[PDB]
Structure 1
């Protein structure tokens, strides 16, 4: 909408207060004009029609319980935009400052979030498996990263290319969580998953097997559920990424960690310069090796550590 840029205040899903960028034109809208061609947050009103209504508020204060998922979807989309711009010199998901749109209050009891090809969508959860999913900064960044992948490598959402697609979203979701620096970890979704159980998460990158996911190519899932295991076999790549950054000895193979920033540079370059829609795990290894070579040199520790990490997870 046309209006003037304003700053509202509200509370997110976890009860924390934050300022948000809004737009005033009769109402205050969840429309942040400070980033690209805007960040826009919509109310899906418990239905499945998308996007729903651009979020309108009478007083620019967002402290109602119903407001909380919108506050966080809007704010964390801004953090994710800032990460891509400031760290990777990427302007929104398309590289051209495309408007970023999210809908909250999608459906009833909906234990998931997704990118639908055009926008982000967040359920409220059923209150037992999830609380509203935009409360997780890693979740929000996972979703926006699907848009980045779709505009760049274009990894098809099936089998190994789809597991790479998933891992890219977990990797950058985690790197955004570290960028914001509030309780960062190598776990996925912990802030919104299972409110009645402390210390768990949907997936672990540091130890995927904690939640049943493979941590070695020999343990990969080969069936048809979950689009050929895209959220399962992502553990193999998540583990490799974790090892590149943090190091470790895994199935007897030692990896010297090179840190999160270099992990992010290597994988961002692989995603945007070398991967293709049908890349498999072996092709990802080659893309990561080439990316590290471009950035750090063929004889660098960074290249050596990429090779060790893929060796450790059984990907040649």
Structure 2
């Protein structure tokens, strides 16, 4: 909407207070004009029609329970925008400051979040498997990264290219979590998964097998569930990314870590310059090797570590 930029205050899903960029015109809207062509957050009102209604509030204070998922969707979309702009010089998901749209309160008891080709969508969870999923900064950044992938490599969401699509979202979701520097880790969704169980998450990048996902190409899922295992075989690539950043010895193969910033640079360049819609795991290795060569030189430690990491997970 047309109005004047304002700053509201509210509480997120985990009870933390934060300031949010809003727009005033009769009501205060969850419309952040300070980033690109805007960040816009919508109320789906427990239904499945999208996007729903642009979120309107009478007093620019967002402390109601019903407000909390909207506060976090809005705020963490902004953090993710900031990461891509400040770290990769990328302006929104299309590189041209496309408006970022999110809807919360999608359906009833909905234990997921997703990017629907046009916008981010967050369930509230059923209160047992999940609490409202926008409470996870890694979840929000995972979803917005699907938009980045759509506009760049375009990885088709099935089989190995789909597992790469998933891993790219987990990698940059995690790097956004570290960028914001609030309880960062290499696990996915820990802040919103199973409120009755401490210390678990949906997935682990540092040890995918902790939640049953493969950490070596020989253990890949080859059936048809989950679009050919896109949330399962992502563990193979997630483990390689973790090893590139942090190092380790895995199935007897040693990897010297080069840190998160260089991980991010290598995989951002691979995503935007070398990957294609049908890239498989072997082609991702080649793309990452070439990206590290572009950035650091053929004989660099960085290139050596990329090769060791893919060796360690059985990807040639």
With the length of structure 1 as denominator, give the TM-score of the two structures: 1.00
Counterpart CA distance in 2 for 1:11 and 1:124 is 16
Could you list the per-position Cα deviations for residues 134-174 of structure 1 after superposition, in whole angstroms to 9, with x for gaps in the alignment? 00000000000000000000000000000000000000000
Counterpart CA distance in 2 for 1:45 and 1:58 is 17
CA drift at 1:98: 0.1
CA drift at 1:264: 0.1
Which residue pairs with 1:61 in the alignment?
61
Question: Is there any run of 5+ residues in structure 1 with no aligned partner, and where?
Answer: none
CA drift at 1:86: 0.1
CA drift at 1:17: 0.0
CA drift at 1:38: 0.1
1:236 is paired with a residue of what secondary structure?
A: helix
CA drift at 1:107: 0.2
Matched, 1:8 2:15: no
2:171 is paired with a residue of what secondary structure?
A: helix
Counterpart CA distance in 1 for 2:91 and 2:164 is 23
Detail structure 1 runs of 4+ shifted over 4 Å in the superposition.
none
Could you list the per-position Cα deviations for residues 59-80 of structure 1 after superposition, in whole angstroms to 9, with x for gaps in the alignment? 0000000000000000000000
2:191 is paired with a residue of what secondary structure?
A: coil
Could you list the per-position Cα deviations for residues 175-202 of structure 1 after superposition, in whole angstroms to 9, with x for gaps in the alignment? 0000000000000000000000000000
Number of residues paired by the alignment? 316
CA drift at 1:213: 0.1
Question: Is there any run of 5+ residues in structure 2 with no aligned partner, and where?
Answer: none
Counterpart CA distance in 1 for 2:38 and 2:150 is 20
Counterpart CA distance in 2 for 1:262 and 1:107 is 39
Structure 2 matches for 1:20-39, cutoff 5 A?
20-39=20-39
CA drift at 1:27: 0.1
Counterpart CA distance in 1 for 2:187 and 2:160 is 21
Counterpart CA distance in 2 for 1:161 and 1:152 is 13
1:126 is paired with a residue of what secondary structure?
A: coil
Counterpart CA distance in 2 for 1:38 and 1:280 is 35
Which residue pairs with 2:196 in the alignment?
196
CA drift at 1:22: 0.0
Counterpart CA distance in 1 for 2:126 and 2:173 is 23
CA drift at 1:35: 0.0
Counterpart CA distance in 1 for 2:311 and 2:112 is 33
Which residue pairs with 2:227 in the alignment?
227
CA drift at 1:50: 0.1
Counterpart CA distance in 2 for 1:266 and 1:6 is 37
Counterpart CA distance in 2 for 1:234 and 1:141 is 16
CA drift at 1:261: 0.1
Counterpart CA distance in 1 for 2:180 and 2:128 is 27
With the length of structure 2 as denominator, give the TM-score of the two structures: 1.00
CA drift at 1:20: 0.1
